[PDB]
Design a protein around this ligand. Structure first.
Ligand code: ADP
Ligand code: ADP
Lengths: 398, 399
């Protein structure tokens, strides 16, 4: 099979054509300035052959037509007919809640995706401009919609429920949903491999550390617990998010600062995290340097961040009654041996130990734990497009 | 010296006259339905004598007057007159960052307590009513105040700091405070003893499960982290407290129902917890009964509670890098073998096992963990009163 993973944008359209027989990215491209002028489409064939074309792209519908022209090119393409694409994937975050499985996008899925709109204080809704374009260009083609919150639908009631009046979950659907589902599920499957055992007999703690970070407890290959909840705000302190602070602080600030419902929300999701603590930046590579340069704020901010992730490794250690391995992925988890150490140091009491040398290695699936460590600690890079591809396949297959 | 410890609530008043000389508790009482119907005071003497008086108690002032009477009863009492009460130790949950240590009562302390009301709406207000009633019945008696936040004052910056705009820390003093200190500290000392090791060489997980629940990670007899934060709402789910939910739920709920900051606050501190889930009550005993009799809401309520305390045990295990013991105390943790069984089940992976039989034992300091368990699990009754008593004596004695 061959899957085309799409990713709609404001005025762009990223794509990948993956051959699922070897999970090889045959081609990779990106459309830009869609609707705007000076439109361009850039493609890169696996065998080192980039192609650029300056054709105006009025609508993503047209842009998608060019993506096909690029794949079909015999000199810079990788497929003769458009009929070689038997599946298309699209990742969805908000509007995805309440979906236990990846839908095969039919007439009843737009509404479903259009329902979780206002529902939950979610910013940028599902950019459908790039999804509806498939129904046109290639109708007789399977289109799967991957949900970043579906992976956590296996969580038990005593976990996704809040100790709040039951009518809230019943009247507004207030429950813990979780995110980074595709990333968490991908590395999970990977970890099980490196453990040399069936995913069914493995207890893994997956750590997605990026601008928005999230931890998940993976038992027998299913999400049983996750750090985020109703919204991505719950959980670890991250780039600009506050995380799980004292709920009472929310209304407190609103009164002491004469704020609005929207002002407090912005401050927790945009003006907080390491950005608000360091007062310097939300980007970690920057905070890391500032820190080593003697910057108190930055340093403090990094201590909070690592500390919270550490606390979570422990919290999920209980939730899973013993953890076989811990996985670190995403931007921070993959390139920062610095923060990985801050996090993993001082956990030998719970079976965690890391080989400072293997830890230095960057970008590579490696087991940075010591050989005597009771718990393995893997560093697995997340391949999103490939994850969306595996999913679309699983659906189209079954 | 004989100290009188007060623990006032919105309609109750737990008192206890302790004789600091030999440190023996003379009498223990409890006033209920203060301000409501069928007000009632109860007292138990050191020899088992129980008194009960059914009289109207409109204000705490009245209740306290009746306490003096109950304490000076001819046969069921312990003192001949109010004068034998040398000092009064009062409990106060929040003192602000302006008062993080026990101190003699004066207009300054009173001001601070009155201002921290918004930081402890369920407690400070009622605690103040006690200090007040106390100033009206025994104006000539010294009063020392002990704060629930003192014990956690040793938490490191990377723990009491929230990941919010730093100026909010300097501007409104927002940081984690923690509560139930007096309790956490006591049972911690006891855990060291049961371990037969010097406090400075221990790592304990103290769990105070009661109307209000909180867990603390004590390292070397020092509070390093606690479940509650700025106010007593953060942390575990409670009788009527939601605990640490998703902050983003506050603005959402507020807009979805045009709730006001005052309202949403009331919903989080009074309508949530196991009360909100079960839709039945905040009493863990009633919930325990209802659950077993087929009540799902109550069933789920206790499930959610036991699960939350479980995770913290796991959380603070990473904080202490291997805990030496997990200590259970307070209303629930002391008496509910039931709830404890829910919490401790399925933790052998992190080295925790319990002897289901020893776990049935009532209120007694007993180690309910298997002899081979890598982690001890003591069931230690709390003694907030002797603690406050000692504090009171110290402050007053030392001028
Ligand atoms: N035998 C018991 N079984 C179950 N829960 C109990 C029991 N005894 C006490 N509790 C729990 O403790 C709560 C009150 O404890 P706490 O807050 O420490 O106050 P108090 O000073 O009255 O003990 C009760 O609402 C809840 O049921
Ligand atoms: N070498 C590094 N040192 C520190 N932080 C890094 C490093 N590499 C990546 N990061 C983190 O990853 C982020 C990358 O953002 P992005 O590519 O969108 O991925 P993510 O979703 O993981 O954040 C950077 O802002 C930084 O926070």
């Amino acid at each position: 099979m061959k899957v085309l993973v799409i990713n709609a944008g404001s005025s762009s359209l990223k794509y990948q054509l993956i051959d699922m027989t070897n999970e090889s990215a045959l081609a990779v491209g990106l459309c830009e300035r869609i609707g705007i002028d000076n439109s361009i489409i850039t493609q890169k064939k696996f065998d080192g052959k980039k192609l650029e074309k300056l054709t105006d792209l009025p609508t993503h519908k047209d842009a998608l037509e060019e993506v096909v022209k690029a794949l079909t090119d015999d000199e810079f393409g990788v497929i003769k007919d458009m009929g070689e694409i038997n599946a298309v994937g699209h990742r969805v975050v908000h509007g995805g809640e309440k979906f236990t499985t990846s839908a095969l996008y039919d007439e009843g899925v737009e509404k479903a995706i259009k329902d979780c709109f206002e529902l939950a204080p979610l910013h940028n809704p599902p950019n459908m401009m790039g999804i509806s374009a498939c129904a046109e260009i290639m109708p007789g083609t399977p289109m799967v919609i991957v949900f970043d919150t579906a992976f956590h639908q296996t969580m038990p009631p005593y976990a996704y429920m809040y100790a709040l009046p039951y009518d809230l979950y019943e009247k507004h659907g207030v429950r813990k949903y979780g995110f980074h589902g595709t990333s968490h599920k991908y590395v999970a499957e990977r970890a099980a491999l490196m453990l040399g055992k069936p995913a069914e007999e493995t207890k893994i703690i997956t750590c997605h550390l990026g601008n928005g970070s999230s931890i998940t407890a993976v038992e027998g290959g299913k999400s049983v617990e996750t750090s985020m909840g109703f919204t991505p705000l719950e959980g670890l302190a991250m780039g600009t998010r506050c995380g799980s602070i004292d709920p009472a602080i929310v209304p407190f600030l609103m009164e002491k600062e004469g704020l609005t419902t929207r002002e407090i929300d912005t401050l927790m999701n945009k003006k907080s995290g390491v950005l608000g603590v360091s007062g310097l930046s939300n980007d970690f590579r920057d905070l890391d340097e500032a820190a080593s340069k003697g910057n108190r704020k930055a340093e403090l901010a990094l201590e909070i961040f690592a500390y919270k992730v550490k606390k979570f490794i422990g919290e999920y250690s209980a939730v899973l009654n013993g953890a076989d391995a811990v996985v670190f992925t995403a931007g921070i988890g993959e390139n920062s041996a610095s923060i990985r150490k801050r996090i993993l140091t001082g956990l030998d009491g719970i079976g965690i130990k890391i080989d400072d040398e293997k830890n230095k290695i960057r970008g590579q699936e490696i087991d940075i734990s010591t050989p005597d460590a009771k718990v393995r600690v893997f560093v697995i890079p997340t391949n999103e497009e490939l994850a969306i591809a595996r999913e679309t396949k699983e659906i189209v297959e079954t």
